[PDB]
Design a protein around this ligand. Structure first.
Ligand SMILES: O=C(O)c1cccs1
Ligand SMILES: O=C(O)c1cccs1
Ligand SMILES: O=C(O)c1cccs1
Ligand SMILES: O=C(O)c1cccs1
Ligand SMILES: O=C(O)c1cccs1
Ligand SMILES: O=C(O)c1cccs1
Length: 358
């Protein structure tokens, strides 16, 4: 690799791993259409398996970027519209609070205060109807952003209905296959368990538990190589041969709402480049708190802006993830770790790395 990339990465991540006590980590720097990969430590501490470029990490909420792009692809295929009422795709959702609630609202956490998690007690389709029917919004739709797996989760399940496919089958055939993401899974197959890192929470090996709408919200597992290939796809969507996917990518990085310096996409979140990293490390958008934030409608949404810092953070109980990229500079980073560690620390490291290379 270029020494500059070697040097800044090792100098940023090595202290990070020490301070946060991360068992294993994988990083990709994507620069001018080329990836550069770094690994540290252990996928499996007990079996002394090292992190490699084929190690699978749980992405957590970075999964939502796939969901965003899959939904944007369904839009480009003419199957759904973000302006459509939720009840168009789920007519059994007859409770009156759902009047005015669109697929845009679900996709961007603006439905009016959908809760962070689908409850664990929700298992069947009947349970899921019951849960959504019985939810009472705090706010009118399109007024406040509150981050929620139950919001974008439902968006993901409804977006694929007209296709005829299960979410998993739609994602595989429409996003993973076309982009050649061959080591990216919603369900890790027995053949790949050898590559699947354990997460560590309080020093215990853990994997993400099954739950309603897990695939759509936090359930994707991937390797650093496939994740770099994902960053490259989102950095240069016009290089993509499949027209509805290329368009779906652009729809996912479009700006639908503003709060402070952040713009809400479909899965992806954006700031204007150059960025002052204080809001995303120290201030209102550092993700420490679950934050109800009034939003300004971007009417109509701004098409994907090249001069953006585009990012998404994710966690499961055992894992911490981060992806950020600047299409203008043809520059991106993926950071995958098998311990959940504070988001500000993730963003601080990413910023130091990309600010130095840009
Ligand atoms: O105005 C409305 O639709 C609402 C106010 C509070 C919950 S929904
Ligand atoms: O796998 C590949 O060719 C690439 C991943 C990121 C940029 S190019
Ligand atoms: O985007 C947000 O507000 C959050 C992501 C994770 C916790 S809060
Ligand atoms: O800049 C503005 O007017 C607003 C940001 C968030 C709600 S309104
Ligand atoms: O090339 C472009 O216009 C873009 C790449 C990513 C968002 S817009
Ligand atoms: O089991 C886990 O780690 C999680 C379940 C839902 C979000 S993370």
């Amino acid at each position: 690799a270029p020494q500059q990339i070697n040097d800044i990465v090792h100098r940023t991540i090595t202290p990070l791993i020490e301070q946060q006590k991360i068992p294993g980590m994988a990083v990709a720097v994507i620069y001018q259409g080329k990836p550069y990969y770094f690994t540290w430590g252990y996928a499996d501490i007990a079996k002394k398996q090292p992190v490699t470029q084929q190690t699978l990490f749980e992405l957590g909420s970075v999964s939502k970027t796939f969901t965003g792009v899959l939904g944007g692809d369904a839009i480009a295929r003419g199957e759904i519209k973000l302006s459509d009422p939720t009840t168009k795709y789920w007519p059994e959702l007859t409770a009156k609070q759902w009047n005015g609630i669109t697929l845009l609202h679900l996709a961007t956490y603006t439905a009016g205060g959908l809760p962070l998690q689908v409850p664990d007690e929700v298992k069947s389709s009947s349970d899921l109807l019951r849960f959504y029917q019985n939810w009472q919004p705090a706010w009118a739709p399109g007024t406040q952003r509150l981050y929620a797996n139950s919001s974008i989760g439902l968006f993901g399940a409804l977006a694929v209905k007209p296709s005829g496919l299960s979410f998993e089958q739609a994602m595989q055939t429409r996003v993973f296959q076309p982009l050649k993401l061959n080591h990216t899974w919603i369900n890790v197959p027995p053949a790949e368990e050898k590559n699947y890192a354990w997460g560590y929470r309080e020093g215990k090996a853990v994997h993400v538990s099954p739950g309603a709408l897990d695939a759509e919200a936090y359930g994707v597992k991937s390797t650093i190589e496939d994740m770099a290939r994902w960053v490259q796809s989102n950095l240069k969507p016009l290089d993509i041969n499949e027209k509805t996917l290329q368009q779906g990518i652009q729809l996912a990085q479009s700006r639908y709402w503003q709060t402070g310096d952040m713009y809400q996409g479909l899965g992806w979140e954006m700031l204007d480049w150059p960025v002052n990293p204080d809001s995303i490390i120290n201030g209102s958008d550092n993700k420490i708190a679950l934050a109800a934030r009034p939003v300004k409608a971007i009417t109509p949404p701004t098409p994907a802006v090249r001069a953006s810092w585009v990012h998404k953070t994710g966690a499961t109980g055992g894992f911490g993830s981060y992806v950020a990229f600047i299409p203008e500079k043809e520059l991106g980073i993926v950071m995958l770790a098998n311990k959940n560690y504070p988001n500000p620390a993730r963003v601080d490291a990413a910023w130091q790395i990309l600010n130095a290379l840009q």
